[PDB]
Design a protein around this ligand. Structure first.
Ligand SMILES: Nc1ncnc2c1ncn2[C@@H]1O[C@H](COP(=O)(O)OP(=O)(O)OP(=O)(O)O)[C@@H](O)[C@H]1O
Ligand SMILES: Nc1ncnc2c1ncn2[C@@H]1O[C@H](COP(=O)(O)OP(=O)(O)O)[C@@H](O)[C@H]1O
Ligand SMILES: Nc1ncnc2c1ncn2[C@@H]1O[C@H](COP(=O)(O)OP(=O)(O)O)[C@@H](O)[C@H]1O
Ligand SMILES: [Mg+2]
Lengths: 281, 97, 1544
């Protein structure tokens, strides 16, 4: 039972759902509980004096803001959700989120398109860490955009390949996918001419027939002369294994950025780590 | 007359876009052109070694991020920012080519 | 608790049943049940009314059981009626858009269909009314608001379908069917019009006229879609010769025909159809050109699939399914909703991106969220897309009152009808409410997704979702759209779970050059591309170059207003040319007229008529240079409105205003009036922005009168102060329990205009908002002041703005409004230079020469005085130069021209009244011209001095006097050093010093330092005269100065000379609202309904009421810089009344005036007063009396005091000197910088004299050392008790010793300065000094007795405890003596207070605060305390702790109680009657026979003042003390602060 906090009817529904689930064993999630800090005290008190079913679970989704009670934080287990820390981690999360049966479908090129989409999403989100340079403003490139792009890829691949086991890379609707991702899915958030220019550059570079060649370069000159190579596999397992064997040497050049973009940020983060270690000596 | 030949720092002006509009308006009035049919072209030269014509205005303090300007041609660089010594803003008629 | 409910239920059920006479035919069984209930009600009516006594009717058996049975029956029938209403709404779901009472009216008036015509507008997109035969029995067709109509293929017969729901459903179905058939025929014809090398114009115009504006554009789009599809199919072979060029050529020739059509004159409907077709075909031509350039040869190419394509299949039987609309992979069926005639949007590269994104969202079964800045086409693009698919699009202007329930009802309506919901300004909801609404949105979207599955069949269970604990059928046609202006003020942040339910789209840069090119092209502008290429860069350069002002807007709302004005100007000029050709010649060739037409001149005229009025003085040359550069050579000269100028001349003459032409005096103001007239012509939403006193109100009033006399249309103005009332009272409230909507002020006014019961639609109605603008209240008017012209309420009601109504705002700045409000209104900028000072002088002199002051010899005196004052009231005159100099001095308040001018004018009116009084006192010898001249000149100088420097200190007054002496020629006093400010003007016409009015008096020994005693001082005699002058004119005024300066003493001394004025004390705090003033009005005034309106006047006839506001600048400013109470008072002073929110009735004040007092606005917690409020209130600065004045005031008090002991007669002067010196050093040493409560004023000097007098009164004799001991004891108690640090106490003690030995050298130091200076009347009868050990023994014995009868907590006695109990006992023995004990908890404050109260015979009352304690409980405890102390004459020590303050209302009530001794709003209703009875018996017991309520309440207030003592204990917080210094200002000037602190 999913309940969104904020209204009195919401509190009544939450109380009823919790009272029913602690006996029946259902799950209950209350969303945006940070909007009712006063009610969180009562919820914690209610939970403490309780012996619920073995399978009962209570999920409380909230934004990270100081209004959340300390006692509720201590009483429950905290799970911080945030952008994945790097291209490799982002692509691993993307491949874990999408079900296996969806990627492995009638056209064998669907797995390659999903891999290209995962790489594009990882590159797009990782540039956000460099706010003035990677983009012009902190856009909210999130899971909704990735799901919409996956839906678009599925729909247009199904339309172009009527159940055929194989479709030619030229026959793939590249223009449809690029235009939709630059106009509706990812380009909707973009309100800048130059950010739109950058998004179009990335989409025309990644989503093309040449991406199915064996010599395709996902990112050129990532460090000196070395460059990222497109996987030559055709199955989801091959792409996932390529992601897992990615080097742990990510630099801004993977994103197309100069390698000096992270110097100031890394220095500030190191100083902040020193200050945090000293703060709790 | 002297206000045309002084190199301004666009970062030191309260409204630099008003300065760009004022220079455009000066060029349009001087040559009896129309404002809407004027385009801008930029020529980066040395501050001392430069000549300002009737349509060129000098601007200082412009910093180029992630690129270098040599002979008015751009090249990528690993420097965070490269200073442009003197930027000349020339207003010319639109060509639509 | 049952009779009232049953009575109400029967009343409204009887109203429903009787009003709807046809409800019985369709609700039979409950009609019979209510018939029986009505018979029972009639039996009750005939039984209970026979005996009009409660006892006579409760003794009758069978009444309560029958009452319960009737309650159950009424509840059951109400539930049955509600269930019937829901069931009837299930069929024909369009009833979800009308109210419950509206639905009942529809039910009861099914027989007569004339009443049904006013409800079709809100149940249909464009159906204004239905078309009926003469019999009114068959529905022929429907009509739009523009008059356009569609005739049904098969008319719907009401006789064959008598039930309302059945024939309404048939009407809707037949609407859809007939639109489908008409579209089929129109498509068949336009297909012939297609694939043609040439088009006959006559046939094309015939086809355009035949069909509706919707269907012609739809058919054109269809035919073009099949043409392009066929051409691409031909090219699908690969390499085939392109027939797409043929499609482009066909589009171009049809566009040529349409463009030639718009030059010549057309009927307005056919003109609008031509404009729509021009826009559509321009879009089609652009798309075809793009297809040709891209070399598209496949119909499956995305360059064609991305476009919107129409596929018409008339063969299919279903009405919705003949036409299919497809964009990319999204497929929609045309809804065939009659949309009337809408305004079409140029489809630009952003309305094409918006269409694509929103259709992709729709195909994903989740909403769309176009976002961006203001004026980007977000709402209009959503509406245009909805109209493109033929959907019913409902626009809602969201605000914080759109709670979970209101949004739930709206969603239920949209789900059942199958309509699109555009929720604009959606982030204006509360964040919690957005979070709650996300659940409903998610449920609806899940219902849509489960509907979309192929497994679902329409023959299976209908698709439903849980909305508001009910299963609601979800139509697949539903859509939800939200448009948000992110980062704007007054907007909330959407929860992240809500944002994933919408597909956002940034709409930030509309393609303005295309909208202008297409808009000018469709209006008949030859060379529209050149005009667009000039006008869009012009707006960009205006935005870049012009200065940044809060009211500037150069966006698409400005282009669109400029382009519309350009079209109107072109039409007007064509008509003028036709008339001129009629005057000279006969040949009227429209082609030649259009050929030789100055279109650039027309565009410049529109720009000047729309953009120039808002420009500030320094920006006008910039915009005119931009115009002369963008449009070189083209010049425009404004056409004179000669008739309007004449009519304005007459209005200004009758209103005593100055009129001018061009560069004449008043020319700028008349130009501004004409600009306001033009902006009124082009805009339906208006703002008059400009500094206070710039002429805005006079501008629009004169314009309204001139328009009434010029056009013959009566002008009605409704002026509303939007911020003087709560937004709930401004727009209305929806009851959370019964869902009952109560109209606000603006809502009631607009609904009254729309109803037009008294012909309000035939009059020019202007709704003026004269007040501050913030995004909280003004953004509810976003749908009103837009192109929707609609007010949407949370209860689902929508009120269309009539075309004769103008919404006008008269503001002084727009610094808090967002760009969403600024962009929707036409600005007129009134600089202060518009209203020159000469114009104000002329207005004053005209009113003086015309309007008599008494209500004629008085008018003759006024005319003579005006003739005398004329030379000085000229430009570059004495008054002008003095005002210019006065602006260079520094005043206690921000000086404004009109405040000084109003003060001066009122003072001159008082001079005229003085001359009239002199004439009345000398009937034999009236004042001659020479004496009048001398008096008027000298009084003019005196009034200039007191009006231009009254609110400034002595130095600035002297400077202004010196400047006036330098510049003037009026005779002035010849004294070499005495300033002119120290002189008055005798009625004989000569300067006389104020010191002649200051006599050295001898106060009676029993009136020493009494509250009503004022030693005459030069400043007192001057300020009293000034206050008399301002009060006698009933002018509002403000006294400013340090606390204790003597502002209230001066006001009460001046009011003593005015016997017909009664003052009422109001103490404002930071939580003050207009509710305090309203309670004062309820207590002291009464409302009477005169034939002219409702009038609020004091209860006592013939007496003027003065509302004295003690701290007028304390009330908190909201986050938008507005004090609501100050706005309320400014409304009551400007317009002479206010709005009663009970029934939205304008109440006019009578015999009520306002006087304010305040500390300087630079003091902590004090806010500067508004310039619009300060314009009407003169300010007088009352400063602290200086050492000479202090020596004079307290020297008289000490001389009066020391007459008690004749042996001490010689010590008055040194005693007063010591008092003044120590007070001065204490004031210099301890300032408010250190601690907030370190405020020292002459009030302490008075408490000093009073304390020494009370300690000296009973003694028969006393040595000098005893006098010094009393002096030092009072000095310690007044200057050392409030000190925090021990260093301050040590300094105070040492300097007390120093001063005492300095001014009294030959005294015994030890016998007078023995450090434990203790005085007590506990051991003896008198207040003689007490020793520490005997006092300790006495306190020990009394503490033993205290333990025996009261609290048994043992206490340890140390010297500080003895000091503290003596200090508390001092306060408990004084009238209105309140304590403020500050110290750490557990220090003994409450116990010592209780113990001392026990000694003094004071009852201890403490409020029992708990978790459920609220405001009403505190009010009841206050009522109990007040009744005990006042009515029963009981001495009570009201001990209250800061922890008991659970709300700011407690502190507000305690502030009023502590200051006044009575809370005006505490006793109201039956409680007031009981209190008044008890006061009657109490006064009888005391021995006073009082009858009237006024004198009883005065006695009650005096008793509460004498008896009630309030002890307030708090911890010594740093910021808490500062907070309380503003939340409860009476805690620091009515209480006696004692700093206990921690134990040393
Ligand atoms: N044309 C005029 N000639 C002479 N006096 C005028 C004229 N117009 C206004 N006044 C007077 O000058 C003063 C300006 O007040 P007005 O009501 O016009 O200002 P306002 O713009 O409404 O200012 P506020 O914002 O304080 O209401 C008033 O005393 C008004 O009567
Ligand atoms: N001429 C005077 N005669 C008598 N008292 C005076 C005089 N001038 C000042 N005072 C004293 O100044 C104080 C002013 O108190 P109040 O009228 O409440 O001032 P405010 O309204 O400025 O707070 C009183 O103690 C009053 O007795
Ligand atoms: N001089 C004292 N001797 C003994 N107990 C004291 C003394 N002063 C305070 N107390 C203690 O203070 C407590 C009561 O607190 P109270 O005086 O009501 O607090 P507050 O000073 O905050 O108003 C009792 O326990 C009492 O014994
Ligand atoms: Mg909008």
């Amino acid at each position: 039972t999913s309940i969104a906090i904020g209204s009195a009817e919401g509190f009544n529904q939450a109380d009823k759902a919790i009272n029913t689930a602690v006996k029946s064993g259902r799950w209950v999630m209350l969303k945006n509980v940070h909007l009712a800090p006063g009610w969180l005290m009562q919820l914690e008190k209610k939970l403490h004096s309780l012996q619920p079913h073995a399978c009962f679970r209570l999920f409380l989704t909230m934004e990270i803001n100081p209004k959340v009670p300390v006692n509720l934080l201590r009483a429950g287990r905290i799970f911080v959700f945030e952008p994945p820390p790097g291209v490799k981690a982002n692509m691993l999360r993307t491949f874990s989120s999408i079900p296996v049966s969806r990627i492995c479908k009638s056209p064998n090129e669907r797995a390659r398109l999903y891999f290209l989409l995962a790489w594009f999403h990882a590159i797009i989100q990782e540039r956000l860490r460099y706010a003035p340079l990677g983009w012009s403003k902190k856009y909210e490139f999130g899971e909704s955009d990735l799901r919409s792009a996956c839906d678009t890829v599925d729909t247009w691949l199904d339309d172009t390949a009527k159940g055929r086991q194989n479709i030619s890379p030229d026959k793939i609707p590249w223009s449809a996918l690029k235009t939709l991702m630059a106009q509706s899915i990812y380009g909707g958030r973009v309100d800048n001419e130059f950010d739109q220019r950058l998004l179009n550059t990335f989409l025309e570079r990644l989503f093309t027939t040449r991406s199915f060649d064996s010599e395709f370069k996902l990112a050129c000159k990532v460090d000196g002369h070395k460059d990222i190579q497109m996987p030559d596999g055709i199955r989801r397992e091959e792409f996932v294994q390529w992601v897992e064997l990615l080097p742990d040497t990510q630099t801004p050049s993977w994103l197309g950025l100069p390698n000096n973009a992270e110097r100031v940020l890394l220095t500030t983060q190191g100083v902040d780590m020193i200050s945090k270690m000293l703060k709790m000596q | 007359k002297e206000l045309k030949n002084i190199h301004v720092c666009l970062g030191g002006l309260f409204v630099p876009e008003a300065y760009i509009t004022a220079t455009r308006q000066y060029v349009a009035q001087a040559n009896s052109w129309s404002l809407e049919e004027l385009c801008l072209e930029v020529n980066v030269t040395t501050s001392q070694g430069a000549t300002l014509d009737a349509c060129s205005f000098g601007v200082t303090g412009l910093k180029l991020q992630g690129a270098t300007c040599n002979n008015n041609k751009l090249s990528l660089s690993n420097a965070i920012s490269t200073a442009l010594p003197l930027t000349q803003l020339r207003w010319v008629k639109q060509t639509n080519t | 608790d049952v009779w009232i409910d049953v009575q109400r239920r029967w009343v409204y059920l009887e109203g429903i049943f009787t009003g709807s006479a046809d409800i019985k035919h369709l609700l039979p069984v409950e009609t019979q049940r209510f018939q029986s209930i009505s018979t029972e009600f009639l039996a009750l009516m005939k039984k209970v009314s026979k005996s009009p006594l409660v006892m006579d009717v409760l003794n009758i058996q069978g009444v309560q059981r029958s009452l319960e049975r009737l309650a159950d029956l009424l509840g059951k029938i109400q539930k049955a009626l509600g269930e019937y209403l829901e069931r009837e709404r299930s069929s024909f779901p369009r009833f979800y858009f009308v109210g419950d009472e509206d639905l009942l009216e529809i039910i009861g008036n099914s027989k007569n269909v004339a009443k049904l015509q006013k409800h079709f507008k809100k149940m249909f997109a464009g159906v204004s009314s239905i078309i009926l035969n003469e019999d009114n029995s068959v529905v022929l067709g429907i009509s739009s608001r523009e008059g356009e109509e569609v005739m049904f293929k098969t008319p719907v017969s009401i006789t064959e379908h008598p039930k309302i729901n059945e024939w309404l459903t048939l009407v809707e179905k037949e609407m859809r069917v007939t639109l489908a058939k008409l579209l089929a025929e129109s498509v068949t014809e336009v297909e012939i019009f297609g694939k043609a090398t040439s088009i006959d114009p006559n046939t094309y115009i015939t086809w355009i006229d035949k069909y509706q504006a919707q269907l012609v554009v739809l058919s054109a789009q269809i035919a073009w879609s099949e043409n392009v599809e066929t051409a691409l199919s031909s090219m699908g072979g690969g390499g085939d010769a392109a027939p797409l060029h043929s499609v482009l050529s066909n589009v171009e020739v049809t566009l040529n025909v349409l463009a030639d059509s718009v030059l010549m004159e057309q009927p307005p409907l056919r003109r609008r159809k031509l404009e729509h077709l021009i826009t559509e075909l321009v879009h089609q031509r652009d798309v075809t050109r793009s297809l040709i350039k891209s070399k598209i040869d496949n119909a499956k190419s995305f360059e064609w699939l991305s476009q919107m394509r129409f596929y018409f299949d008339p063969k299919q039987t279903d009405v919705l399914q003949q036409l299919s609309i497809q964009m990319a992979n999204a497929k929609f069926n045309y809804g065939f909703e009659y949309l009337g005639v809408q305004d079409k949007l140029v489809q630009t590269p952003l309305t094409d991106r918006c269409y694509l994104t929103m259709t992709q969202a729709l195909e994903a079964r989740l909403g769309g969220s176009p976002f961006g800045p203001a004026g980007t086409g977000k709402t209009e693009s959503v509406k245009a897309l909805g109209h493109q698919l033929g959907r019913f699009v409902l626009v809602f202007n969201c605000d914080e009152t759109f709670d979970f329930q209101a949004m739930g009802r709206i969603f239920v309506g949209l789900c059942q009808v199958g309509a699109w919901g555009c929720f604009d300004e959606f982030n204006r909801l509360e964040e919690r409410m957005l979070s709650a609404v996300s659940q409903q949105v998610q449920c609806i979207q899940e219902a849509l997704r489960e509907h979309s599955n192929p497994n679902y069949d329409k023959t299976s269970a209908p698709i439903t979702c849980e909305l508001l604990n009910k299963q609601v059928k979800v139509s697949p046609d539903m859509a939800i759209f939200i448009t948000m202006n992110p980062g704007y003020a007054g907007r909330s942040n959407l929860p992240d779970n809500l944002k994933k339910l919408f597909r956002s789209l940034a709409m930030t840069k509309p393609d303005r050059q295309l909208i202008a090119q297409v808009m000018l092209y469709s209006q008949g502008f030859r060379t529209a591309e050149v005009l667009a290429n000039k006008i869009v860069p012009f707006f960009k350069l205006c935005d870049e170059q012009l200065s940044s002002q809060s009211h500037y807007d150069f966006g698409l709302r400005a282009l669109k207003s400029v382009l519309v004005s350009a079209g109107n100007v072109k039409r007007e000029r064509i008509q003028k040319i036709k008339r001129e050709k009629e005057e000279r010649g006969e040949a009227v060739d429209e082609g030649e007229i259009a050929e030789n037409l100055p279109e650039q001149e027309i565009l410049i005229q529109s720009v000047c008529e729309t953009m120039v009025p808002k420009l500030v003085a320094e920006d006008i040359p910039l915009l005119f240079s931009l115009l002369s550069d963008v449009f070189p050579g083209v010049q425009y000269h404004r056409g004179e409105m000669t008739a309007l100028r004449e009519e304005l001349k007459k209005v200004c003459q009758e209103m005593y205003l100055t009129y001018g032409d061009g560069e004449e005096v008043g020319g700028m103001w008349v130009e501004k009036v004409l600009q306001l007239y033009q902006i009124t012509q082009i805009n339906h939403g208006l703002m008059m922005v400009g500094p206070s006193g710039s002429g805005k109100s006079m501008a629009w009033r004169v314009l309204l009168k001139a328009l009434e006399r010029l056009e013959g249309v009566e002008g009605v103005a409704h002026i509303i102060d939007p911020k003087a009332i709560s937004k709930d009272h401004l727009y209305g409230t929806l009851d959370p329990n019964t869902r009952e909507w109560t109209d606000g002020l603006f809502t009631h006014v607009l609904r009254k205009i729309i109803d037009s019961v008294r012909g309000e639609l035939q009059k020019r109605q202007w709704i003026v908002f004269d007040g501050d603008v913030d995004p909280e209240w003004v953004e509810n008017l976003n749908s009103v002041l837009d192109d929707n012209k609609l007010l949407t309420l949370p209860n689902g009601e929508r009120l269309s703005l009539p075309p004769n109504v103008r919404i006008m705002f008269e503001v002084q700045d727009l610094k808090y409004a967002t760009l969403a409000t600024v962009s929707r209104c036409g600005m007129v900028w009134f600089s202060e230079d518009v209203l020159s000072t000469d114009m104000i002088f002329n207005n004053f002199l005209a009113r003086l020469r015309s309007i008599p002051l008494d209500e004629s010899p008085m008018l003759q005196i006024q005319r003579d005085a005006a003739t005398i004052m004329q030379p000085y009231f000229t430009s570059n005159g004495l008054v002008t130069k003095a005002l210019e100099h006065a602006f260079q001095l520094e005043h206690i308040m921000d000086l404004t021209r009109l405040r000084c001018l109003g003060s001066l004018f009122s003072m001159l009116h008082q001079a005229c009244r003085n001359v009239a009084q002199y004439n009345a006192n000398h009937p034999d010898f009236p004042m001659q011209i020479e004496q009048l001249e001398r008096y008027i000149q000298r009084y003019l100088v005196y009034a200039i001095l007191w009006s231009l420097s009254g609110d400034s200190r002595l130095k600035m007054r002297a400077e202004l006097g010196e400047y006036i002496r330098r510049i003037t020629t009026v005779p002035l006093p010849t004294a070499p050093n005495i300033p002119i400010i120290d002189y008055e003007v005798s009625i004989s016409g000569e300067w006389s010093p104020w010191q002649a009015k200051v006599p050295q008096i001898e106060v009676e020994t029993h009136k020493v330092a009494a509250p009503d005693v004022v030693v005459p001082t030069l400043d007192t005699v001057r300020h009293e005269a000034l206050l008399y002058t301002w009060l006698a004119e009933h002018k509002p005024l403000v006294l400013c100065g340090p606390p204790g300066s003597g502002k209230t003493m001066t006001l009460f001394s001046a009011l003593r000379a005015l016997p017909d004025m009664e003052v009422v004390g109001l103490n404002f705090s930071s939580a003050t609202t207009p509710e305090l003033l309203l309670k004062t009005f309820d207590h002291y005034c009464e409302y009477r309904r005169t034939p002219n309106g409702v009038v609020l006047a004091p209860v006592q006839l013939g007496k003027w009421l003065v509302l004295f506001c003690d701290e007028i600048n304390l009330p908190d400013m909201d986050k938008y810089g507005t004090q609501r109470v100050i706005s309320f008072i400014r409304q009551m002073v400007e317009h002479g009344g206010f709005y009663r929110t009970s029934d939205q009735t304008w109440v006019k004040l009578e015999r009520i005036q306002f006087v304010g007092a305040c500390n300087p606005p630079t003091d902590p917690g004090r806010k500067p007063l508004s310039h619009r409020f300060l314009r009407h209130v003169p300010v007088v600065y009352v400063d602290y009396p200086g050492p000479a004045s202090l020596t004079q005031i307290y020297g008289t008090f000490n001389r009066a005091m020391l007459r008690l002991i004749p042996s001490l007669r010689t010590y008055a002067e040194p005693l007063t000197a010591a008092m003044v010196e120590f007070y001065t050093m204490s004031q210099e040493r301890f300032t408010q910088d250190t601690q907030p409560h370190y405020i020292y004023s002459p009030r302490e000097m008075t408490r000093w004299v009073r304390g020494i007098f009370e300690a000296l009164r009973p003694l028969e004799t006393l040595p000098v050392e005893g006098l010094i001991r009393i002096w030092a004891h009072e000095a310690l108690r007044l200057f050392q008790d409030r000190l925090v640090e021990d260093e301050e106490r040590r300094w105070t003690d040492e300097n007390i010793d120093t001063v005492a030995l300095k001014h009294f050298p030959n005294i015994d130091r030890e016998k007078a300065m023995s450090r434990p200076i203790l005085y007590s009347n506990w051991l003896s009868k008198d207040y003689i000094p007490v020793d520490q050990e005997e006092l300790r023994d006495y306190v020990k014995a009394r503490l033993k007795v205290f333990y025996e009868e009261e609290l048994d907590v043992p206490l340890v006695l140390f010297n500080e405890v003895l000091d503290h109990v003596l200090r508390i006992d001092r306060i408990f023995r004084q009238p209105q003596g309140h304590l403020l004990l500050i110290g750490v908890s557990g220090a003994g404050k409450t116990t010592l207070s209780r113990f001392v109260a026990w000694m003094n015979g004071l009852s201890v009352y403490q409020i029992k605060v708990h978790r459920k304690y609220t405001g009403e409980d505190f009010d009841e405890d206050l009522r109990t305390v007040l009744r005990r102390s006042g009515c029963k004459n009981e001495k009570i020590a009201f001990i209250m702790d800061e922890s008991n303050v659970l709300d700011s209302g407690f502190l507000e009530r305690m502030n009023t109680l502590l200051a006044n001794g009575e809370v005006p709003g505490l006793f109201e209703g039956d409680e007031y009657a009981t209190l008044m009875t008890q006061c009657k018996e109490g006064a009888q017991k005391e021995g006073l026979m009082l009858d009237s309520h006024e004198e009883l309440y005065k006695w009650f207030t005096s008793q509460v003042i004498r008896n009630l003592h309030v002890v307030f204990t708090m911890n010594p917080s740093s910021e808490g003390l500062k907070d309380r210094a503003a939340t409860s200002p009476a805690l620091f000037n009515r209480c006696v602060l004692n700093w206990f602190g921690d134990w040393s």
